[PDB]
Design a binder for this molecule. Structure first.
Ligand code: CLA
Ligand code: CLA
Ligand code: CLA
Ligand code: CLA
Ligand code: CLA
Ligand code: CLA
Ligand code: CLA
Ligand SMILES: CCCCCCCCCCCCCCCC(=O)OC[C@H](CO[C@@H]1O[C@H](CS(=O)(=O)O)[C@@H](O)[C@H](O)[C@H]1O)OC(=O)CCCCCCCCCCCCCCC
Ligand SMILES: CCCCCCCCCCCCCCCC(=O)OC[C@H](CO[C@@H]1O[C@H](CS(=O)(=O)O)[C@@H](O)[C@H](O)[C@H]1O)OC(=O)CCCCCCCCCCCCCCC
Ligand SMILES: CC1=C(/C=C/C(C)=C/C=C/C(C)=C/C=C/C=C(C)/C=C/C=C(C)/C=C/C2=C(C)C(=O)CCC2(C)C)C(C)(C)CCC1
Ligand code: SF4
Ligand code: SF4
Lengths: 64, 94, 41, 35, 31, 80, 165, 143, 75
C-alpha cells in the first residue's frame, strides 16, 4: 500500500545533521517512489535559515 | 584593434585590444655625446655583473663597520664620548 | 478600547511599566527605611 | 669593559649589515620560481 | 678580576663554531 | 580553486545555480528526488567562494558545500 | 569578635568617621541661614547621618581597623555570633524572591506554549494570566519541590535536541 | 545539436565615454573576458565597472576583466532588458574559449547530457573522519 | 503647472488597531516573531519609509508628519 507513516502523524527526527534532531514534527506527505528522502516533515521551530520543512528517509523518523 | 569605428576588439590584432602601449616611450639613438657616453660605459665596465655590483654594496657594509669603529669617534658621537659623574638612586642604592 | 489595552500589554510598554513600578517601590522603601545595610528583623 | 671597541662594531653588524643581508637573501629566495 | 679581551675573543670564536653547528642543523632540518 | 560538493539530499530546486555569480553549478538529470534533477559543479575553477549557493539551499543540512582551499587569480576575484 | 574584628560600638575609628562626616556637614551648613531651604536640607542630612551611624552601632555590626562595617558570610559562624542578618537571612530572602519571579515566568511560558500562537503571547503578554501566575509564584518552593519529586519539572535528555558531537 | 558560437571581432562596442575601472595590465599577460549580446534598440545600461553606457541597436561586444563582471552584466540584461548574451574567455596568445551558456541551455535548466561532476552519493555527515585520512593531502569531502 | 495647495482628504483612519499589531508597516515582519531577530528588525526599519511602501507620496507624507512630531518633541 503506502510506505512510511501516514500524513499528519507526529514523528521524531533521528538525523543528527538536522536542526530538529530528537524533535517532533508533523508528516505532511510521503512520496510513493524510489526517493531517498520521501518523508516530508513540517516543524513549528524554524531553523537558522528560516525553514520549517524538511525531507527525511523512512529510517530517519520514529512514530510518536 | 581596428578601432576605425566602434570596434575595440580584434583577434587578429589582440595586442592593441588589451591596451599594450608605450604611451611615452620613444626610440632614438642620437642624444648622448659619444665622448661622454664612452667615458661612463668604460667606468661601469665590469660592474654590470650581479656578483661585482654586490661587491660595491659590500663596501658600504664595510663603511658601516668603519664608522662604528672609527667614524663615530671622529664625529664626537655622544655614545663614544665620555661620561660625567652619576646618581645614587631612590634609596641607599647605586 | 480593546486595541488600546492590547497595545498597553505589549512587551515594551509592560517592561517599562514594570521597571517603573519596581523602581518606585524600591525608592519608597529606601525613603522610609534608609541605610538598610543588613536584614535586622 | 674589556675591548670597548667590540660593541661599536658588533651593534652595527647585527643591526645594519646582518638585517640588510638577511632581508636581501630572503627576498631573493622567496621569489626564485625554482628552488 | 674582570675578564680580559682575550677571553672575549675566545668566547666569540667558540660562538662562531656553535653558529656553524646551528646552521648545519638548520640545513639538515630543511631537507 | 575551492572544493564544491553536492549531496543526495538535494531536492533539485535550482536555487544554488541561480545564486552562483560565476556560473559554477548546473542542473543535470537525476532520479533521487521528485524534481528528477541534481546539482553539479563542473567549473569549480571559476568558483570564488562567496558561498551564495549555500545561503540559497533550503535543505537541512545543506546539500551543497564549499570548502575553501588553494587560492588562485580567479578564486581571489582579482582584476589586476 | 570573629576574625580579629572589633564591634562598631567600641570602635574608635567608627566614632571618628561619624564625627568627621557630621563636622563636614556642619561646616557646609555654617554658610547659610537658620531657616532657609539649604539649611533645612543640610540639617536633615546631618540627622540622617547620625541615625545611620547609631543604627549601625546598635545593630551589632563588626568594624575593622578602617572603622567600616564588615559582613560575615558563613553559616554557623554568623549564627553563633549573632550575624545571621548579614548574608544568611539576605540569602534566604533573595533566593525566595528570585525563585518567585523565575517560577512565575516559567509557568507563564509553559501556559502560553500550549496556545495556537505562543510567539504573539510572548510579545503581547496576557495581563490577567500573568497577574494570576505572579500571585501563584509566591508558593514557588512547595510547587518546585512537588514537581521535582513528581518528575514533571525536567525534560528527558532523549527529547532535547543536541549537536552532532 | 549545439555547437559553441564563434566570437566575431567585427561586433561594435557600446557607446561609452571611458572610465578608470576598465581593463588593467592583467588582461595583457593573463586573460580577459568578452560578452556579446543582441539588443533590439539603443538604450542606456549600467556597466559593472562604473558609469553608464549605451548599447547600440544590434550586436554589442564588451570586454571586461573578470568573468564575474560579464556574468553580472548578463544578469542585468536578462532581468532588465530580456536580452541573452554569450561570454568568452580570451588569452593574450589569441585563444577564445566559450563559457557561460556552455551547452546553449542555461545552467538553471536541466539539459540531459551534461557532466554530473562533484556529486557525492552520501549525506554531509556521512563523510570520513578527519583522523581516518590523516597524512593525506585531502579533505574528508574528497572521499 | 501653477503652484497651489493640493491635498487629499482623510487618507488614514485614526484608531489603535495597528498599535496592537507591531510590525504592521513591514511586509517581511508579518510572519510573526519566530526568532529574536524579528524584534531588532522591528526597530531597525521603523523609519525606513522607502521599504514600507513604493509610493513617493506616502513617503513624503510620512516624512512631513515625522517632522511635525520632532518639532513637538523639541518644543
Ligand atoms: C666629521 C667627519 C670626519 C672627520 C673630521 C674625520 C677625520 C679623520 N679621520 Mg675619519 N671617518 C669618518 C668621518 C670623519 N673623519 C667616517 C664617517 C668614517 C666611516 C667611513 C671614517 C673612517 C675613518 C677611517 C678608517 C680612518 C679615519 C681617519 C681620520 C683621520 C685622518 C684623516 C683621514 O685620512 O680621514 C679618512 C682624521 C683626523 C684615519 C685615522 O687613522 O684616524 C687617525 C683612518 O684610518 N676615518
Ligand atoms: C510605583 C510605586 C510606588 C509606591 C508603592 C508608592 C507608595 C507611596 N507613595 Mg509614591 N510615588 C511614586 C510611586 C510609588 N509610590 C512615583 C513614581 C512618584 C513620582 C510622581 C510618587 C510620588 C509620591 C508623592 C509626592 C507622595 C507619595 C506618597 C506615597 C505613600 C502614600 C500612600 C506611599 C507609601 C506620599 C507620601 O510621601 O507619603 C507621606 C506623597 O507625598 N508618592
Ligand atoms: C548584586 C549587587 C548589589 C547588592 C547585593 C546591593 C545591596 C544593597 N544595596 Mg546597592 N547598588 C548596586 C548593587 C548592589 N547593591 C549598584 C550596581 C548600584 C549603583 C546603581 C547600587 C547603589 C546603591 C545605593 C545608592 C544604595 C544601595 C543600597 C543597598 C542596600 C539596601 C538594601 C535595601 O534596599 O533595603 C531592603 C529592600 C527590600 C527588602 C526590598 C526587597 C523586595 C524587592 C522589591 C524584591 C525585588 C524583586 C525584583 C543593600 C545591602 C542602599 C544602602 O543603604 O546601602 C547600605 C543605598 O543607599 N545600593
Ligand atoms: C641569545 C643570547 C644573547 C642575546 C640576546 C645577546 C644580545 C646582545 N649582545 Mg651578545 N653574546 C652572546 C649572546 C647573546 N647576546 C654570547 C653567548 C656571547 C659570547 C660569544 C655574546 C657576545 C657578545 C659580544 C662581544 C657583544 C654582544 C653584544 C650584544 C648586544 C648587541 C648585539 C650585538 O650586536 O652583538 C652581537 C652578538 C654576537 C656576535 C654573539 C651572539 C650570538 C648569539 C648566541 C646568537 C643567538 C641566536 C638565537 C639563539 C637565535 C634567535 C633567532 C634570531 C637570530 C632571529 C645585545 C644586547 C654587544 C654589546 O655588548 O653591546 C653593547 C657586544 O659587543 N654579545
Ligand atoms: C560554602 C563553603 C563553606 C566553608 C568554606 C565553610 C567553612 C567553615 N565552617 Mg561552614 N557551613 C557551610 C559552608 C561552609 N563552611 C554551609 C553551607 C552550612 C550550612 C549547612 C554551614 C554551616 C556551618 C556550621 C553550623 C558551622 C560551620 C563552621 C565552619 C568553620 C569551621 C568548620 C570546619 O570547616 O571544620 C571542618 C569541616 C569538616 C567537614 C571536617 C569554617 C571556617 C563552624 C563554625 O562556626 O566554626 C566555629 C560551625 O559550627 N559551618
Ligand atoms: C521565564 C524566565 C527565565 C527563566 C525561568 C530562566 C532560567 C534559567 N536561565 Mg535564563 N534568561 C532569561 C529568562 C529566564 N531564564 C532571559 C529573558 C534572558 C535574556 C537576557 C536569559 C538569559 C540567560 C543566560 C545567558 C543564561 C541563563 C541561564 C538560566 C539557567 C540558570 C539560572 C540563571 O542563571 O538565570 C539567569 C537569568 C538571567 C541571566 C536574566 C534573567 C532575565 C529576567 C530577569 C528574568 C525573566 C523575567 C520574565 C520575563 C518575567 C515574566 C513574568 C511572567 C508572569 C510574564 C536557568 C534554568 C544560564 C544557564 O544556562 O545556566 C545553566 C545562562 O547562561 N539565562
Ligand atoms: C535628520 C537626520 C537623520 C534622519 C532623518 C535619518 C533617517 C534614516 N536613517 Mg540615518 N543617520 C543620521 C541621520 C539621520 N538619519 C546620522 C547623523 C548618522 C550617522 C550616525 C546616520 C546613519 C545611518 C545609518 C548607518 C543608517 C541610517 C538609516 C536611516 C533610515 C532608517 C532609520 C531607522 O529607522 O533605523 C532605526 C532607528 C533606531 C534603531 C534608533 C536607535 C537610536 C540609537 C541606536 C541609540 C543612540 C543612543 C542615544 C544617543 C541616547 C543614549 C542613551 C541611552 C543609554 C538610552 C532613515 C530613513 C539606516 C538605513 O537603512 O537607511 C535607509 C541605516 O542603516 N542612518
Ligand atoms: C667585503 C668584500 C668587498 C668586495 C669588494 C668588491 C669591489 C667590486 C669588484 O671587485 O668588482 C670586480 C669587477 C670585475 O670586473 C671584471 O674586470 C675584469 C678585468 S680585471 O680583472 O679587473 O682586470 C674584466 O675582464 C671583466 O670583464 C669584468 O667583469 O671589477 C670592476 O669592474 C670594479 C670596478 C669599479 C669601478 C667603479 C668604482 C666606483 C665609482 C664611483 C664613481 C663616483 C665616485 C666618486
Ligand atoms: C649601506 C649598505 C649596506 C650594505 C650591507 C651588505 C650588502 C650585501 C648585499 C649582499 C646580498 C646577500 C648575498 C646575495 C643574496 C643571495 O644569494 O641569496 C641567498 C639565497 C638566494 O636564494 C637562491 O638560492 C638558490 C638555492 S636553491 O634554489 O634553494 O637550490 C641559489 O640559486 C642561490 O643561492 C639563490 O639564487 O637565499 C637563501 O637561501 C638565503 C636564506 C637565508 C638567509 C639568511 C642566512 C642566515 C644568516 C647567515 C649565516 C650567518 C653566519 C653563520 C655562521 C656563524
Ligand atoms: C676568526 C677571527 C675573526 C672573525 C671572527 C668572527 C667572524 C666571529 C663571528 C662570530 C659569529 C658571527 C658568531 C655567531 C653565532 C651565531 C649563533 C650562535 C647562532 C645560533 C643560532 C641558533 C642556535 C639557532 C638557530 C635556529 C635554528 C637551528 C633553526 O633551525 C631555526 C632558526 C634558528 C631558530 C635561528 C676576525 C677576522 C674578526 C679576527 C681574526 C680571527
Ligand atoms: S561559493 Fe559562490 S562561486 Fe562558488 S559555487 Fe557557491 S555561489 Fe558559485
Ligand atoms: S540549492 Fe540545494 S537543494 Fe537547491 S538545487 Fe542547489 S544543492 Fe539542490
Amino acid at each position: 500500500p503506502d510506505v512510511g507513516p501516514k500524513r499528519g502523524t507526529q514523528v521524531r527526527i533521528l538525523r543528527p545533521e538536522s536542526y530538529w534532531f530528537r524533535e517532533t514534527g508533523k508528516v505532511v506527505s510521503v512520496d510513493q517512489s524510489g526517493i531517498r528522502y520521501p518523508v516530508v516533515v513540517r516543524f513549528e521551530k524554524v531553523n537558522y535559515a528560516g525553514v520549517s520543512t524538511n525531507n527525511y528517509a523512512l529510517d530517519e523518523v520514529v512514530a510518536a | 584593434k581596428y578601432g576605425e569605428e566602434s570596434r575595440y576588439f580584434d583577434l587578429k590584432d589582440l595586442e592593441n585590444t588589451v591596451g599594450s602601449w608605450d604611451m611615452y616611450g620613444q626610440e632614438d639613438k642620437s642624444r648622448y655625446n659619444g665622448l661622454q657616453s664612452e667615458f661612463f660605459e668604460r667606468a661601469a665596465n665590469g660592474l654590470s655583473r650581479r656578483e661585482y655590483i654586490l661587491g660595491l654594496v659590500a663596501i658600504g657594509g664595510a663603511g658601516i663597520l668603519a664608522w662604528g669603529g672609527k667614524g663615530a669617534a671622529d664625529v664626537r658621537l655622544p655614545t663614544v664620548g665620555p661620561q660625567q659623574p652619576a646618581q645614587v638612586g631612590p634609596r641607599g642604592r647605586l | 478600547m480593546k486595541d488600546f489595552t492590547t497595545y498597553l500589554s505589549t512587551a515594551p510598554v509592560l517592561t517599562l511599566l514594570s521597571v517603573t513600578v519596581v523602581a518606585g517601590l524600591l525608592i519608597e522603601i529606601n525613603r522610609f527605611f534608609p541605610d538598610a545595610l543588613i536584614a535586622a528583623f | 669593559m674589556s675591548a670597548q671597541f667590540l660593541p661599536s662594531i658588533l651593534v652595527p653588524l647585527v643591526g645594519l649589515v646582518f638585517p640588510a643581508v638577511a632581508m636581501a637573501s630572503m627576498f631573493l629566495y622567496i621569489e626564485k620560481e625554482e628552488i | 678580576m674582570p675578564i680580559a679581551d682575550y677571553q672575549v675573543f675566545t668566547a666569540l670564536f667558540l660562538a662562531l663554531a656553535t653558529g656553524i653547528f646551528a646552521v648545519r642543523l638548520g640545513v639538515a632540518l630543511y631537507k | 580553486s575551492h572544493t564544491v560538493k553536492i549531496y543526495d539530499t538535494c531536492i533539485g530546486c535550482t536555487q544554488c545555480v541561480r545564486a552562483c555569480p560565476t556560473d559554477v553549478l548546473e542542473m543535470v538529470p537525476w532520479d533521487g528526488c521528485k524534481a528528477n534533477q541534481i546539482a553539479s559543479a563542473p567549473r569549480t575553477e571559476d568558483c570564488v567562494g562567496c558561498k551564495r549557493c549555500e545561503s540559497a539551499c533550503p535543505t537541512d543540512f545543506l546539500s551543497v558545500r564549499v570548502y575553501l582551499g588553494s587560492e588562485t587569480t580567479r578564486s581571489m576575484g582579482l582584476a589586476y | 569578635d570573629v576574625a580579629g574584628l572589633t564591634p562598631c560600638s567600641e570602635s574608635k575609628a567608627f566614632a571618628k568617621r561619624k564625627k568627621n562626616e557630621v563636622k563636614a556637614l556642619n561646616k557646609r551648613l555654617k554658610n547659610y541661614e537658620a531657616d532657609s531651604a539649604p539649611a533645612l536640607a543640610l540639617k536633615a542630612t546631618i540627622a540622617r547621618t547620625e541615625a545611620r551611624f547609631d543604627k549601625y552601632a546598635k545593630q551589632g555590626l563588626l568594624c575593622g581597623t578602617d572603622g567600616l562595617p564588615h559582613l560575615i558570610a558563613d553559616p554557623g559562624l554568623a549564627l553563633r555570633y549573632g550575624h545571621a542578618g548579614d548574608v544568611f537571612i539576605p540569602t534566604i530572602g533573595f533566593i525566595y524572591f528570585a525563585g518567585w519571579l523565575g517560577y512565575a515566568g516559567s509557568k507563564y511560558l509553559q501556559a502560553v506554549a500550549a496556545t495556537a500562537k505562543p510567539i504573539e503571547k510572548e510579545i503581547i503578554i496576557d495581563v490577567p494570566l500573568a497577574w494570576k501566575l505572579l500571585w501563584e509564584g509566591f508558593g514557588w518552593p512547595l510547587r518546585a519541590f512537588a514537581e521535582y519529586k513528581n518528575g514533571s519539572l525536567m525534560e528527558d535528555d532523549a527529547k532535547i535536541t543536541v549537536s552532532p558531537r | 545539436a549545439f555547437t559553441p558560437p564563434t566570437l566575431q571581432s567585427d561586433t561594435p562596442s557600446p557607446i561609452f565615454g571611458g572610465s578608470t575601472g576598465g581593463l588593467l595590465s592583467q588582461a595583457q599577460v593573463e586573460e580577459f573576458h568578452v560578452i556579446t549580446w543582441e539588443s533590439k534598440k539603443e538604450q542606456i545600461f549600467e556597466m559593472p565597472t562604473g558609469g553608464a553606457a549605451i548599447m547600440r541597436q544590434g550586436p554589442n561586444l564588451l570586454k571586461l576583466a573578470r568573468k564575474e563582471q560579464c556574468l553580472a552584466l548578463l544578469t542585468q540584461l536578462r532581468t532588465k532588458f530580456k536580452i541573452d548574451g554569450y561570454i568568452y574567455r580570451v588569452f593574450p596568445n589569441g585563444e577564445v574559449q566559450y563559457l557561460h551558456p556552455k551547452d546553449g541551455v542555461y545552467p538553471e535548466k536541466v539539459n540531459a547530457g551534461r557532466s554530473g561532476d562533484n556529486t557525492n552519493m552520501r549525506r554531509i555527515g556521512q563523510n570520513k573522519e578527519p583522523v581516518q585520512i590523516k597524512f593525506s593531502g585531502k579533505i574528508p569531502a574528497e572521499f | 503647472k501653477k503652484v497651489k495647495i493640493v491635498v487629499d482628504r482623510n487618507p488614514v483612519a485614526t484608531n489603535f488597531e495597528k498599535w496592537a499589531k507591531p510590525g504592521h508597516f513591514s511586509r517581511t515582519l508579518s510572519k510573526g516573531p519566530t526568532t529574536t531577530t524579528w524584534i531588532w528588525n522591528l526597530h531597525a526599519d521603523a523609519h525606513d519609509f522607502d521599504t514600507q511602501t513604493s509610493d513617493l507620496e506616502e513617503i513624503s507624507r510620512k516624512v512631513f508628519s515625522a517632522h511635525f512630531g520632532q518639532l513637538g518633541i523639541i518644543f
